[PDB]
Amino acid sequence: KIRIKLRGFDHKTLDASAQKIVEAARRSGAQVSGPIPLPTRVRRFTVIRGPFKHKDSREHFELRTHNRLVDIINPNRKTIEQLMTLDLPTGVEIEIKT
Amino acid sequence: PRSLKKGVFVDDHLLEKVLELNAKGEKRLIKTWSRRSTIVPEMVGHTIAVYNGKQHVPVYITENMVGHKLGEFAPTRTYR
């Protein structure tokens, strides 16, 4: 069991990093279950537009944390040969739990 | 419906002062800026001046008013 929890503020960045990881692991390993998408944590913030009222003008923004899962099955060495440190994306964030 | 629920809170300020005042006999007017504290039995007989926020008003403390607070007898408001 090698869980790879992928999280980010950018969805194309998550797709890029996850697909690169899977393409690296597809040349060594199994029938890997691959890129499963998880629901996104949506944080909304409503803010009154103008300081010193006009109460009924507020606009809101939304941040969204996207999550992806990999679940590589039976990787030994060649998978982690293409894994140690080779990635471009910066806004991406990766965790590994076993 | 009023509740303090355990170790009924009385501030140290007047607590130690009055428990040492009782030992030498009853004293005259005391100074009180802490109306947050609860009245305790041994306070009966004294004359306690409490703060309105502006003034210092004396209060005769009796057996009947033990359970209440200091400040129930010092009205903050002034009307008519």
């Binding site: 980010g8 910066t90 991406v92 964030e93 | -």
Partner: protein
């Protein structure tokens, strides 16, 4: 009372954040504070060096502060001297062991914040604002830039009453978010008052 900030509109498509990293409940606050401190320092010192954008990236305790300059000679300095002091002063505020990066921006008249700084400079020394405006719009228009636009705030030329300035050219459609509209704000602090300078620049289509 209208016309919300254009870059805030644009952040999603055809525009990117000045800080692109990830955080959580326990980290985002003082990390954002640290970003604000970085931009504050770089606006204290590097204003006259012709800087436009500060892009900060974080992977894991790695910082990638990227300074886009119109004149990299003042940022690097002779023999690299000035990339030693304020690159160390940068780490004398944050204990994150951060390194600094420089990059070139072509046509300082093509970047809207730089044009705003330029017009604000010419305003602080009290030039006739409309000439600076039209000249800036031409500097923009003389190299691509299918649209250009300049707005100046009240008390123009020192006048008692507040006014509003003008003279855009080309086509500057702030309403539609398609075509990479860049925006910059500058603040001219003068004896008569304060003058806001808004530089809108339209270039490219998709």
């Amino acid at each position: 009372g209208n016309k919300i900030h254009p870059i805030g509109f644009r952040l999603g498509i055809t525009r990117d954040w000045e800080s692109r990293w990830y955080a959580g409940k326990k980290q985002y606050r003082h990390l954002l504070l640290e970003d604000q401190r970085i931009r504050g320092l770089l606006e204290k010192e590097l204003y006259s060096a012709g800087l436009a954008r500060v892009d900060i990236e974080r992977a894991a305790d790695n910082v990638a502060v990227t300074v886009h300059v119109a004149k990299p000679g003042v940022v690097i300095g002779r023999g690299g001297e000035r990339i030693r002091v304020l690159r160390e002063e940068l780490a004398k505020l944050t204990g994150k062991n951060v390194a600094l990066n420089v990059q070139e921006v072509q046509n300082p008249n093509l970047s809207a914040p730089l044009v705003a700084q330029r017009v604000a400079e010419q305003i602080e020394r009290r030039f006739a604002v409309r000439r600076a405006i039209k000249q800036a719009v031409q500097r923009v228009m003389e190299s691509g830039a299918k649209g250009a636009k300049v707005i100046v705030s009240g008390r123009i030329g020192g006048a008692e009453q507040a006014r509003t300035e003008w003279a855009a050219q080309g086509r500057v459609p702030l309403h539609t978010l398609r075509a990479n509209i860049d925006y910059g704000f500058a603040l001219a602090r003068t004896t008569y008052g304060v003058l806001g300078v808004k530089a809108y620049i339209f270039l490219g289509e998709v």
